[PDB]
Amino acid sequence: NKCDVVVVGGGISGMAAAKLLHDSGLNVVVLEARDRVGGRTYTLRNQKVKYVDLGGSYVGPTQNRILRLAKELGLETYKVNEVERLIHHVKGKSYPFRGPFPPVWNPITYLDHNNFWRTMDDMGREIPSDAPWKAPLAEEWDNMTMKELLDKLCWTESAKQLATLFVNLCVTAETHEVSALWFLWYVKQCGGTTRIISTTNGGQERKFVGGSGQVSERIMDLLGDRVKLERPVIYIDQTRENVLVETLNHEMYEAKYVISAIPPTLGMKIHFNPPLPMMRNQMITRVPLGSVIKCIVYYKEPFWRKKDYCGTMIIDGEEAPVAYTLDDTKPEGNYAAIMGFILAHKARKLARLTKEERLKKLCELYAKVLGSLEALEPVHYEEKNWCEEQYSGGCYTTYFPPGILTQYGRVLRQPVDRIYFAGTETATHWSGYMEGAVEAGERAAREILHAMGKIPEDEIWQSEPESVDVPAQPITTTFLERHLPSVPGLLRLIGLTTI
Amino acid sequence: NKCDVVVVGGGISGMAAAKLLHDSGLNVVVLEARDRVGGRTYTLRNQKVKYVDLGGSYVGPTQNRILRLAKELGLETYKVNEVERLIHHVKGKSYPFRGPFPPVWNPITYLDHNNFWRTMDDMGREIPSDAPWKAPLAEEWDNMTMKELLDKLCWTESAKQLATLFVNLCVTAETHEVSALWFLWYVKQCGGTTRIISTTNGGQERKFVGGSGQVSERIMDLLGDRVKLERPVIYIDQTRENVLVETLNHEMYEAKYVISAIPPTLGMKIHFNPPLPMMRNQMITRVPLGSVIKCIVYYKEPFWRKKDYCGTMIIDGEEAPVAYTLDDTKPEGNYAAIMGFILAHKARKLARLTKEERLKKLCELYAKVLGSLEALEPVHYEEKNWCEEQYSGGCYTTYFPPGILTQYGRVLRQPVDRIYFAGTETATHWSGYMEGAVEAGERAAREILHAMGKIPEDEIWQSEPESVDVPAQPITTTFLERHLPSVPGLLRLI
Ligand SMILES: *[C]C1=C([C])[C]=C2C(=[C]1)N([C][C]([O])[C]([O])[C]([O])[C]OP([O])(=O)OP([O])(=O)O[C][C]1O[C](N3[C]=NC4=C3N=[C]N=C4[N])[C]([O])[C]1[O])C1=NC(=O)[N]C(=O)C1=N2/[C]=C(/[C][C]C1=[C][C]=C(F)[C]=[C]1)[C]=[N]
Ligand SMILES: *[C]C1=C([C])[C]=C2C(=[C]1)N([C][C]([O])[C]([O])[C]([O])[C]OP([O])(=O)OP([O])(=O)O[C][C]1O[C](N3[C]=NC4=C3N=[C]N=C4[N])[C]([O])[C]1[O])C1=NC(=O)[N]C(=O)C1=N2/[C]=C(/[C][C]C1=[C][C]=C(F)[C]=[C]1)[C]=[N]
Ligand SMILES: CCCCCCCCCCCC[N+](C)(C)CCCS(=O)(=O)O
Ligand SMILES: CCCCCCCCCCCC[N+](C)(C)CCCS(=O)(=O)O
């Protein structure tokens, strides 16, 4: 029953919050809906795979909070394979390349690709990380879908095609579903377009040895009996002196404060007394999560390396079930695997098939993209459809439809009496990621410490020292990249000269 | 505990369903979250106002199911006052007019205005009521907001701004928030633009004497002790022989079947076992309700009538808190009142003020629009902010953001094992209205009757005879309206 803080949700954010509060000498309890911790991170273990992350997996430079938490728990990272060539597959043809971006030869298309990425970052610098709705043109950009923005920025179909896949891959949603302001914020708060898309020096650089599920599992071992599995929270009562939190099995928990560490829309699963204020009440009906199936196809050997392919494929085409893959082979070089994401409307569409039908379609895709018959000989298959999860709502994270972030964005992490809000969605740096989960979990925990008069106000938001293990090379631009004209800019120059 | 059907929700849809099933001889229970029935309809009574609808209120021709149900319960309608002139307030000036739509005098603006409304109805003709996702251009129309359609279609700012007001008023959401496909479906399934906007011969023609809350209240009286108030449903278990439904106060209800008669997104408040299928699991997080405050200012007399104004105001502009009003005076001519809607973003913005602050702004607005100092002396004020309701989620109804209706639309009323789906959102005619609530409640009830082998499949969807009290007159267009060019059409002719 009685404790200082009830934490709702035993994912990375809630576990990070409970650990901090526990380390500060408080009596904490974690109420987790599932028969496991980790939430949107999940590591399957069996003899065929040894271990595999079916949810969140990748970590990179500038994600210093998740890295410090994992290292303190005794965890280790390894580099995702990007030794050999990446593949860009478009119009049923594959084009090998090196570096983070698929190359473009056509001079007009090159100017258009260059300008697009530059403008994404240009617009990003106008958007405050901690308050996106404060951008000078917040309303104008929020009243617009990402599709509308692509339609007006991209003067070539090639750039529009690549930008569409970029959006699908980043936020597991269609360009027409998401606010332009929101998506521009989301990229900006991950350090920009290059940082977000990169394996080497980016978000996909590394994975944890043994899986990311260990983060939450090892925090559970530290907290012992304080974590309560199979306790979905149904009711929060704040009418009396102590906060009462009721679960589905009719257990009652009494606390001074509560941390909500669940996806914002999943707050709907809780009945509130007194009712939530007007803005939060409506906000939680307006914030869906994206759609993704994560699929891993195992092979006898990482045969793609022999053809000088690292395993990275960027696959454009409506026919392609998977738009993005990475090599998922173990660091020891065994359990050869290709990881792929089925994104947005394709997750919806391909979920109708059987596990066996999906495996078949993926192998047939990889065989064509890699130009390898070997790809038609899988030894094993694992997958996870996050759309069917009652206690996640989707993956990777929450997106904002047009008009919502400016109208409702400011209440996301605004406390409601004695309820404080964590979860990756409330973070200001790598929101949507395991990194943002740690940030938001530890920030929510400190808000409570301040409320109890244990720490000063200026200590609620805490900066993180850079990892020595995973150093961040800075994001650099060239003179040409900065000053090459857009397509309309070149046309302006043509019409002005020839006049 | 043990019954044939548990109905979740004591709104009009749930009550209609329960009444149908009860009259057919089944044991039904209604589980209602609030201390009252009615949901998005609510009739307040005090001696100052006598009675006032603070939620759903208006009914009109073609809404035959709500009219029949209310007539059986002993209810009667009266006509909303539209004898005198309507007012269009544009750029700080009032323009009195007659007929459902404000006149336009600039030739170019006239062509642009004409084309916009015509095109809305043209597009609607290709959208099936029972399956909007089967429209020929469903994906194209669903992937754009109403804002970009208006930007595309309206060559003049005058038309765009009136079209914007129209969207705001119909669906309590911003043009940029909503799918074009969904909005065009919404208008089409109310009988078209003219039918949805009209007072005389449209949706706003009539109100119930004594309030619309009496519909749900009188059905609850007919059901005896079968309606359970302050029983919010928290858990639905379908793993066993009969369905188990748990409430927040720990009570257990067992049934052969369930009707969910709540707004789709409020399905999130229930924990399901087994988990919901994937498409519904994600759908119920993708379907918000609009934002509105309904406000009624009372006066000593209906003074506007003396100046040959009926009370209807169509008010352009960002600064106007209220964009649309109706005379809310009682049929007897006493309790003189003006009803106004504070719509969409204005509802969020003006909720930060006090009740008294909102009253002052409305009175000053009405004084400008009506050209009368008498609007500055209210005798009484009532309001309801529907955004603050845990068990509604907003008003009037559920809107679909771009991409949603085509991807998730068909799951809305698709049964989940032994759970059937009612609620106005699942109706095919006047969805969003009290009428759709009745259609959906009775249809969901008959689906169960068919599942039980009591009626054939062809009796699940039943037609309704036209009301003798509120008959519908046909919607007509003129030759010029149908054949006048658009702005770009007039340009290609030049
Ligand atoms: C799903 C996914 C996938 C598939 C993938 C990925 C992901 C995901 N991500 C994301 C992550 O995972 C996240 O962010 C995290 O995890 C979050 O955390 P939090 O905040 O903590 O949350 P969660 O987990 O959900 O938890 C919660 C909890 O709670 C509970 N509940 C509910 N309800 C309730 C409860 N309890 C009680 N009561 C009640 N009522 C639940 O159960 C849970 O447990 C990620 N991340 C990272 O970091 N990384 C990665 O990798 C990931 N992934 C993805 C990504 C990447 C992709 C990309 C690629 C390429 C490019 F270019 C871009 C991008 C990211 N995101
Ligand atoms: C809010 C509102 C307002 C302000 C106004 C109006 C409206 C609204 N509307 C709408 C109506 O009302 C609706 O539709 C109805 O009501 C619906 O019904 P239903 O479906 O039945 O649903 P509800 O009510 O919501 O119910 C539900 C129930 O459930 C319950 N819950 C929840 N959750 C739960 C429960 N229980 C148990 N458990 C759980 N968990 C709740 O509580 C409830 O009770 C309308 N309508 C009509 O008809 N009329 C009218 O008038 C109305 N309004 C508005 C309109 C008009 C506007 C306009 C003007 C002008 C122009 F031109 C256009 C438009 C319509 N809409
Ligand atoms: C000699 C020049 C005459 C040009 C007249 C032809 C009109 C050109 C239309 C091309 C549209 C290009 N997209 C990318 C689709 C939208 C750009 C948006 S924005 O125009 O830059 O605002
Ligand atoms: C004889 C010269 C030919 C000029 C043709 C005129 C085309 C210029 C369009 C500008 C108006 C833009 N609005 C109205 C906002 C949108 C219209 C979109 S759409 O043109 O119908 O696609």
Short mmCIF file of C-alpha atoms in Angstrom, two decimals, chain B residues 184-465:
data_model
loop_
_atom_site.label_atom_id
_atom_site.label_comp_id
_atom_site.label_asym_id
_atom_site.label_seq_id
_atom_site.Cartn_x
_atom_site.Cartn_y
_atom_site.Cartn_z
CA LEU B 184 -17.13 15.44 -47.40
CA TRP B 185 -18.56 12.13 -46.20
CA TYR B 186 -19.88 13.84 -43.07
CA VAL B 187 -21.78 16.51 -45.07
CA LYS B 188 -23.04 14.00 -47.68
CA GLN B 189 -24.41 11.63 -45.01
CA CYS B 190 -26.39 14.54 -43.52
CA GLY B 191 -28.08 15.07 -46.92
CA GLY B 192 -25.67 17.65 -48.41
CA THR B 193 -24.55 21.22 -47.70
CA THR B 194 -28.02 22.85 -47.82
CA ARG B 195 -29.63 20.26 -45.54
CA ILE B 196 -26.82 20.45 -42.94
CA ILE B 197 -26.70 24.30 -42.74
CA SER B 198 -30.43 25.08 -42.95
CA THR B 199 -32.70 25.93 -40.05
CA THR B 200 -35.98 25.92 -42.01
CA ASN B 201 -35.95 22.56 -43.86
CA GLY B 202 -32.65 21.41 -42.31
CA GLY B 203 -30.82 20.15 -39.21
CA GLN B 204 -31.53 23.19 -37.02
CA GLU B 205 -35.27 23.46 -37.68
CA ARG B 206 -36.54 22.21 -34.33
CA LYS B 207 -35.94 21.55 -30.63
CA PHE B 208 -37.74 19.32 -28.13
CA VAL B 209 -40.11 20.99 -25.67
CA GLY B 210 -38.57 20.48 -22.21
CA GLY B 211 -35.16 19.47 -23.63
CA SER B 212 -33.55 16.52 -25.43
CA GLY B 213 -32.29 15.04 -22.13
CA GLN B 214 -35.86 13.74 -21.71
CA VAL B 215 -35.19 11.12 -24.42
CA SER B 216 -32.59 9.29 -22.32
CA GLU B 217 -34.40 10.10 -19.03
CA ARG B 218 -37.74 8.66 -20.20
CA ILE B 219 -36.13 5.50 -21.62
CA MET B 220 -34.38 5.00 -18.26
CA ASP B 221 -37.83 5.25 -16.62
CA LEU B 222 -39.11 2.58 -19.04
CA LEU B 223 -36.18 0.29 -18.15
CA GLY B 224 -36.81 0.38 -14.38
CA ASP B 225 -33.78 -0.77 -12.39
CA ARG B 226 -31.89 -2.03 -15.46
CA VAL B 227 -29.86 1.20 -15.86
CA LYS B 228 -26.81 1.40 -13.55
CA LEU B 229 -25.45 4.90 -12.94
CA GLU B 230 -21.89 5.63 -11.78
CA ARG B 231 -20.78 2.30 -13.26
CA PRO B 232 -17.83 3.11 -15.54
CA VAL B 233 -16.75 -0.02 -17.43
CA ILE B 234 -13.07 -0.83 -16.92
CA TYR B 235 -12.65 -4.40 -18.13
CA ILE B 236 -14.13 -6.73 -20.76
CA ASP B 237 -13.22 -10.44 -20.65
CA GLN B 238 -14.26 -12.61 -23.60
CA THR B 239 -12.08 -15.69 -22.99
CA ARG B 240 -14.90 -17.70 -21.37
CA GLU B 241 -18.37 -19.07 -22.27
CA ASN B 242 -20.16 -15.82 -21.40
CA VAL B 243 -18.73 -12.28 -21.53
CA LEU B 244 -17.56 -10.73 -18.24
CA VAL B 245 -17.83 -6.95 -17.81
CA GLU B 246 -16.27 -5.27 -14.78
CA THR B 247 -17.01 -1.75 -13.51
CA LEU B 248 -14.82 0.71 -11.54
CA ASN B 249 -16.71 -0.02 -8.31
CA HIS B 250 -15.72 -3.70 -8.70
CA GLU B 251 -19.18 -4.97 -9.79
CA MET B 252 -19.27 -7.93 -12.18
CA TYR B 253 -21.73 -8.39 -15.05
CA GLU B 254 -22.06 -11.53 -17.18
CA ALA B 255 -23.71 -11.48 -20.61
CA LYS B 256 -24.12 -13.37 -23.88
CA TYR B 257 -23.30 -10.18 -25.85
CA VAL B 258 -22.10 -6.59 -25.35
CA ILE B 259 -23.03 -3.34 -27.10
CA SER B 260 -20.38 -0.63 -26.89
CA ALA B 261 -22.34 2.63 -27.16
CA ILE B 262 -19.52 5.04 -26.35
CA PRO B 263 -17.38 7.35 -28.54
CA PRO B 264 -14.78 5.09 -30.28
CA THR B 265 -11.72 6.67 -28.60
CA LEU B 266 -13.30 6.08 -25.16
CA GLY B 267 -12.87 2.37 -25.82
CA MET B 268 -9.35 3.16 -24.55
CA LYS B 269 -10.80 3.40 -21.00
CA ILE B 270 -11.63 -0.32 -21.09
CA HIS B 271 -9.00 -3.06 -20.64
CA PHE B 272 -9.70 -5.98 -22.97
CA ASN B 273 -9.07 -9.69 -22.58
CA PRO B 274 -8.07 -11.07 -24.98
CA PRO B 275 -6.35 -7.97 -26.46
CA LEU B 276 -8.31 -6.15 -29.18
CA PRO B 277 -7.42 -7.02 -32.77
CA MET B 278 -4.58 -4.86 -34.18
CA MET B 279 -6.66 -2.49 -36.33
CA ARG B 280 -9.14 -1.54 -33.59
CA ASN B 281 -6.34 -1.38 -30.99
CA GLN B 282 -4.71 1.44 -33.00
CA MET B 283 -7.95 2.98 -34.39
CA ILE B 284 -9.27 4.02 -30.94
CA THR B 285 -6.12 6.14 -30.45
CA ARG B 286 -6.59 7.91 -33.80
CA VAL B 287 -10.10 9.36 -33.49
CA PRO B 288 -10.45 12.51 -31.35
CA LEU B 289 -13.61 14.54 -30.72
CA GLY B 290 -14.04 18.23 -31.50
CA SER B 291 -13.90 21.24 -29.21
CA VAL B 292 -16.86 23.43 -28.32
CA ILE B 293 -18.39 25.53 -25.56
CA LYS B 294 -22.14 26.00 -25.83
CA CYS B 295 -23.23 29.36 -24.41
CA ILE B 296 -26.70 30.80 -23.82
CA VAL B 297 -27.19 34.48 -22.93
CA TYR B 298 -30.63 35.38 -21.54
CA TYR B 299 -32.48 38.68 -21.88
CA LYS B 300 -35.66 40.32 -20.58
CA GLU B 301 -37.17 40.24 -24.11
CA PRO B 302 -36.29 38.93 -27.60
CA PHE B 303 -35.44 42.54 -28.59
CA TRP B 304 -33.81 41.51 -31.89
CA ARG B 305 -37.25 40.61 -33.34
CA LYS B 306 -38.37 44.28 -33.06
CA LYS B 307 -35.56 45.21 -35.46
CA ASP B 308 -36.69 42.45 -37.87
CA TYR B 309 -33.84 40.10 -36.85
CA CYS B 310 -34.56 36.43 -36.09
CA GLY B 311 -31.51 35.92 -33.87
CA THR B 312 -29.37 34.00 -36.37
CA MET B 313 -25.92 35.53 -36.68
CA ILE B 314 -23.17 34.32 -39.01
CA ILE B 315 -20.08 36.11 -37.72
CA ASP B 316 -16.82 36.25 -39.72
CA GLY B 317 -13.39 36.84 -38.22
CA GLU B 318 -10.73 35.70 -35.77
CA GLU B 319 -11.71 38.17 -33.06
CA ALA B 320 -15.35 37.06 -32.78
CA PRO B 321 -15.52 34.50 -29.92
CA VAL B 322 -18.74 33.07 -31.40
CA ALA B 323 -19.10 32.47 -35.16
CA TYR B 324 -22.73 31.31 -35.13
CA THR B 325 -25.87 31.95 -33.08
CA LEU B 326 -29.52 30.94 -32.98
CA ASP B 327 -32.53 32.36 -31.16
CA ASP B 328 -32.99 30.14 -28.08
CA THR B 329 -36.21 31.74 -26.79
CA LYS B 330 -38.91 29.30 -25.57
CA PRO B 331 -41.85 28.69 -27.99
CA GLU B 332 -44.05 30.79 -25.66
CA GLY B 333 -41.78 33.82 -26.25
CA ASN B 334 -40.42 33.98 -22.70
CA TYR B 335 -36.92 33.18 -21.38
CA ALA B 336 -35.51 35.24 -24.27
CA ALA B 337 -32.11 33.91 -25.24
CA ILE B 338 -29.35 33.76 -27.83
CA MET B 339 -27.47 30.47 -28.26
CA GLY B 340 -23.86 30.66 -29.45
CA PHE B 341 -21.09 28.15 -30.16
CA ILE B 342 -17.45 28.86 -29.30
CA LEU B 343 -15.74 26.62 -31.83
CA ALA B 344 -12.46 24.70 -32.13
CA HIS B 345 -9.30 26.70 -31.25
CA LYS B 346 -11.43 29.52 -29.81
CA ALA B 347 -12.81 27.02 -27.28
CA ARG B 348 -9.27 26.18 -26.07
CA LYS B 349 -8.31 29.87 -26.01
CA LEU B 350 -11.39 31.33 -24.27
CA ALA B 351 -11.64 28.54 -21.66
CA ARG B 352 -8.78 30.31 -19.87
CA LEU B 353 -11.19 33.16 -19.04
CA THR B 354 -13.86 33.25 -16.32
CA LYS B 355 -17.54 32.53 -16.95
CA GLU B 356 -18.17 36.25 -16.35
CA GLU B 357 -15.39 37.25 -18.78
CA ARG B 358 -16.89 35.07 -21.52
CA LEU B 359 -20.35 36.59 -20.87
CA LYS B 360 -19.03 40.16 -21.31
CA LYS B 361 -17.31 39.28 -24.63
CA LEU B 362 -20.44 37.63 -26.05
CA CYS B 363 -22.70 40.51 -24.99
CA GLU B 364 -20.39 43.09 -26.56
CA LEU B 365 -20.14 41.00 -29.75
CA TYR B 366 -23.93 40.57 -29.92
CA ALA B 367 -24.38 44.31 -29.31
CA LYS B 368 -22.17 45.08 -32.33
CA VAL B 369 -23.73 42.46 -34.62
CA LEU B 370 -27.38 43.18 -33.66
CA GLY B 371 -26.71 46.94 -33.44
CA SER B 372 -28.35 47.06 -30.02
CA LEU B 373 -27.35 48.29 -26.56
CA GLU B 374 -29.93 45.89 -25.08
CA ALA B 375 -27.45 43.05 -25.73
CA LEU B 376 -25.27 44.62 -23.02
CA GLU B 377 -27.78 43.83 -20.24
CA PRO B 378 -28.08 40.04 -19.80
CA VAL B 379 -30.36 38.75 -17.00
CA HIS B 380 -28.77 35.29 -16.95
CA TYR B 381 -26.02 33.11 -18.46
CA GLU B 382 -25.47 29.37 -18.94
CA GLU B 383 -22.54 27.55 -20.58
CA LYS B 384 -21.01 24.09 -21.00
CA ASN B 385 -17.44 23.36 -22.03
CA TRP B 386 -17.57 19.87 -23.50
CA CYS B 387 -13.76 19.62 -23.80
CA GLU B 388 -13.54 18.99 -20.07
CA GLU B 389 -15.66 15.81 -20.08
CA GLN B 390 -13.82 12.56 -19.26
CA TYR B 391 -16.73 10.47 -20.58
CA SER B 392 -17.42 12.44 -23.77
CA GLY B 393 -13.95 13.61 -24.87
CA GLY B 394 -15.43 16.65 -26.63
CA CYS B 395 -18.35 17.59 -28.89
CA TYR B 396 -20.18 17.26 -31.11
CA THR B 397 -18.54 14.13 -32.48
CA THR B 398 -15.48 12.20 -33.61
CA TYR B 399 -13.42 13.67 -36.44
CA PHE B 400 -10.89 11.84 -38.62
CA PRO B 401 -7.43 13.38 -39.24
CA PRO B 402 -5.80 12.83 -42.67
CA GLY B 403 -5.05 9.17 -43.51
CA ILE B 404 -7.27 7.61 -40.86
CA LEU B 405 -10.70 6.92 -42.45
CA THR B 406 -9.28 4.86 -45.33
CA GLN B 407 -6.82 2.95 -43.11
CA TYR B 408 -9.06 2.25 -40.10
CA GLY B 409 -12.60 3.27 -41.12
CA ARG B 410 -14.03 -0.19 -41.80
CA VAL B 411 -13.16 -1.46 -38.29
CA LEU B 412 -15.47 1.09 -36.56
CA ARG B 413 -18.60 -1.06 -36.39
CA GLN B 414 -16.98 -4.42 -37.12
CA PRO B 415 -17.91 -6.76 -34.22
CA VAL B 416 -15.15 -8.01 -31.91
CA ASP B 417 -16.30 -11.58 -31.15
CA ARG B 418 -19.40 -10.86 -29.00
CA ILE B 419 -18.96 -7.04 -28.76
CA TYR B 420 -21.14 -5.08 -31.17
CA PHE B 421 -20.68 -1.35 -31.85
CA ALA B 422 -23.21 1.44 -31.60
CA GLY B 423 -22.77 5.15 -30.92
CA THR B 424 -23.57 7.95 -33.36
CA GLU B 425 -20.07 7.64 -34.90
CA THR B 426 -21.05 4.29 -36.46
CA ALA B 427 -24.23 5.57 -38.15
CA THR B 428 -24.59 5.95 -41.93
CA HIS B 429 -27.16 8.79 -41.93
CA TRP B 430 -26.78 11.83 -39.68
CA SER B 431 -23.78 10.26 -37.95
CA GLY B 432 -22.68 12.78 -35.32
CA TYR B 433 -26.28 13.61 -34.41
CA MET B 434 -28.96 12.28 -32.03
CA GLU B 435 -30.45 10.69 -35.18
CA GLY B 436 -27.30 8.66 -35.87
CA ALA B 437 -27.24 7.60 -32.22
CA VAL B 438 -30.71 6.05 -32.65
CA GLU B 439 -29.80 4.43 -36.00
CA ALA B 440 -26.61 2.90 -34.61
CA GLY B 441 -28.17 1.77 -31.30
CA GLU B 442 -31.07 -0.02 -32.99
CA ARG B 443 -28.87 -1.54 -35.74
CA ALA B 444 -26.33 -2.88 -33.20
CA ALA B 445 -29.23 -4.33 -31.20
CA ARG B 446 -30.62 -6.10 -34.30
CA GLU B 447 -27.16 -7.47 -35.19
CA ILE B 448 -27.33 -9.30 -31.84
CA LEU B 449 -30.94 -10.39 -32.50
CA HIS B 450 -29.68 -11.94 -35.77
CA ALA B 451 -26.65 -13.50 -34.01
CA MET B 452 -29.23 -15.13 -31.70
CA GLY B 453 -31.23 -16.42 -34.71
CA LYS B 454 -34.27 -14.27 -33.85
CA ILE B 455 -34.32 -12.22 -37.07
CA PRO B 456 -32.98 -12.75 -40.64
CA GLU B 457 -29.84 -10.93 -41.87
CA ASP B 458 -31.92 -8.56 -44.06
CA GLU B 459 -33.65 -7.08 -41.01
CA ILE B 460 -30.42 -5.77 -39.41
CA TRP B 461 -30.67 -2.46 -41.30
CA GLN B 462 -34.21 -1.08 -41.22
CA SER B 463 -35.67 1.92 -43.07
CA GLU B 464 -37.67 4.57 -41.20
CA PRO B 465 -41.04 6.00 -42.31
#
